[PDB]
Amino acid sequence: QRGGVRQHLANDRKKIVNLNIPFFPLDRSIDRADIQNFREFGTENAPATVDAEVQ
Amino acid sequence: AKAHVATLEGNYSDIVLGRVVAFGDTGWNFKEVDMTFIADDADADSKTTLFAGVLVGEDGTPATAAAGVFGVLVDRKVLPGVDHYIGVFEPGEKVPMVLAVRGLTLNQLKLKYADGTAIDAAGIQALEAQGNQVTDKIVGTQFIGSVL
């Protein structure tokens, strides 16, 4: 009613949490014996190159 | 022939001359309770006998003794000149009413019991115990006497 007591807003909640993180490696190496004296697979007579293997 | 005419005299401030206004909840001075608006056993158009300034106990019923007084009825629905709530309520129906309790500068002359009897010293003590100042002097007015 007009004149009487009013209302209020008095609620809330919060939380907080902490977590870790995993780790994922991956690695490879290339030697001389892998590339020298070989062709590139899909080019017949063209010699092998390091860049193609790296890519 | 007759000329149906009426007068709209009356006011609200005369029952509450002043208030302590809290910077927080402005409703700190009031309370709402469910009183009976229309007489319980009367007809469907028996307008309420309640009038602004009647002492009301905490139970909500109009006060009849000094010990049963808790506040003053100042509801907007009963103020003079706006009492159009005629036949809008069933007999004996309840309705929330605003009561003035604490922090008020009331007018002694307009405080009356359920039957209209004026407030007494015990009622004054009981009502002031809440923190109310019951003034005993309002100037009044003389409108036209042809002398003063």
Walk me through what this model shows.
This is part of a larger assembly, with chains A (55 residues) and B (148 residues). By secondary structure, chain A is an all-alpha fold. Helices cover 16% and strands 0% of the residues of chain A. In chain A, 0% of the residues are buried. With 148 residues, chain B is mainly beta. In chain B, strand 6, helix 1 (121-128) and strand 7 (133-135) form a beta-alpha-beta unit. Chain B is globular, with a radius of gyration of 17 Å. Classes of the chains: A mainly alpha (55), B mainly beta (148). Chain A binds chain B through residues 1-6, 8, and chain B through 25-28, 30-32, 74-77, 96-98. Chain B: Pfam families: Phage_DEC_PhiTE. Chain B: InterPro entries: DEC.
What percentage of residues of chain A falls in helices of 4 or more residues? 10-25%
Query: Within the largest sheet of chain B, what's the order of strands?
Result: 2-5-4-3
Name the shape of chain B in a single word.
globular
- Overall, the morphology of chain A is rod-shaped
Major sheet characteristics of chain B: 4 strands, antiparallel
Helicity range of chain B = under 10%
Number of strands of chain A: 0
Largest sheet of chain A: none
What would the keywords be for this entry?
part of a larger assembly, 2 chains, A: 55 residues, mainly alpha, 2 helices, 16% helix, B: 148 residues, mainly beta, four-stranded antiparallel beta sheet, three-stranded mixed beta sheet, 1 helix, 7 strands, 5% helix, Head stabilization/decoration protein (chain B), DEC (chain B)
Please outline what is shown here.
Chain A: This is Putative major head protein. This is part of a larger assembly, with chains A (55 residues) and B (148 residues). Chain A is 16% helix and 0% strand.
Please specify the SSE layout and strand pairing:
This is part of a larger assembly, with chains A (55 residues) and B (148 residues).
Chain A: H1 32-35, H2 50-54
Chain B: E1 16-19, E2 30-36, E3 55-56, E4 71-73, E5 94-100, E6 104-107, H1 121-128, E7 133-135
Parallel strand pairs in B: 6-7
Antiparallel strand pairs in B: 1-6, 2-5, 3-4, 4-5
